[PDB]
């Protein structure tokens with residue numbers, strides 16, 4: 001009746017493309033076809049992922065829009081709307097003023113990003129992932145470069161979908177990838193836990209490139225023999241213990257994200 005009369009068509013994520021004044025590409029290519037825009041009615045800066053008229057990735061783009069409508073969490077980047085009627089298609093999210101977590105860690109002032117802030121940042125990411133685990137989703141590409149930073153040290157998990165340097169190779173980011181995913185192409189919430197461990201090492205080292213002093217072609221063999229990255233300088237033993245638990249060889253022995261989020265909470269009680 002009235003609903004159908006007033007909403008004849010589309011869902012209440014759908015927006016008119018002309019609601020957004022597109023400004024300039026974000027990140028010089030590093031996020032793909034992602035632009036900063038202004039959602040005019042709200043004078044609100046937004047990030048807009050687009051897909052032009054001629055590509056092979058329509059289905060994946062539409063599935064991404066579909067997936068994002070089903071998830072909502074304070075530490076997952078917020079969908080604001082979509083344009084899916086005709087190309088070029090849009091997915092519009094909030095804009096995160098401090099950009100991606102890897103670059104933030106590398107470029108930040110460490111008087112401000114003290115130990116407590118690193119813990120807060122790690123805890124928030126583990127909360128996003130607990131929610132994904134609980135809702136039966138897998139991330140598949142968890143890493144500092146896929147997280148975003150907002151005002152007040154708010155961190156959110158994102159997925160820029162950018163398989164296509166030597167981060168991704170024939171396309172997997174080997175250094176973040178669980179053994180079972182490298183050897184068998186098996187991905188699960190447990191392989192996300194592995195990646196979270198590497199992410200935590202990134203946090204602990206303020207954005208160092210993982211496996212320093214190690215050739216990429218040798219990584220799987222080393223992990224299999226039992227090598228794991230060393231405890232970073234200044235890394236609390238409890239944080240390293242959790243890292244090492246995320247890197248257990250067998251996926252079943254790795255903690256859940258619920259357990260991981262519980263561990264970070266316990267570290268705020270203890271110290």
Ligand SMILES: Cc1ccc(NC(=O)c2ccc(CN3CCN(C)CC3)cc2)cc1Nc1nccc(-c2cccnc2)n1
Pocket residue numbers: 114115116118119122203204205233234235236239267268271
């Ligand atoms: C989760 C994490 C991971 C790594 C680190 N690392 C550091 O805190 C750290 C310490 C020293 C250095 C070395 N640095 C080299 C250069 N000179 C100038 C300064 C020292 C680097 C990182 C902190 C944390 N944070 C953390 N972990 C557990 C507990 C807490 C915590 C903090 C405050 C209150 N309650 C709990 N905070």
Ligand SMILES: Cc1ccc(NC(=O)c2ccc(CN3CCN(C)CC3)cc2)cc1Nc1nccc(-c2cccnc2)n1
Pocket residue numbers: 026031034047048049064067068077091092093094095096097098099100137138139140148157158159160
């Ligand atoms: C504009 C946009 C469009 C889509 C997305 N999508 C996601 O971030 C995302 C997150 C989680 C999922 C969940 N999904 C579950 C299934 N597995 C297989 C994949 C993950 C999907 C998409 C983000 C953005 N946001 C985005 N993208 C790139 C850069 C920025 C950005 C950059 C700098 C400052 N502020 C924002 N912002």
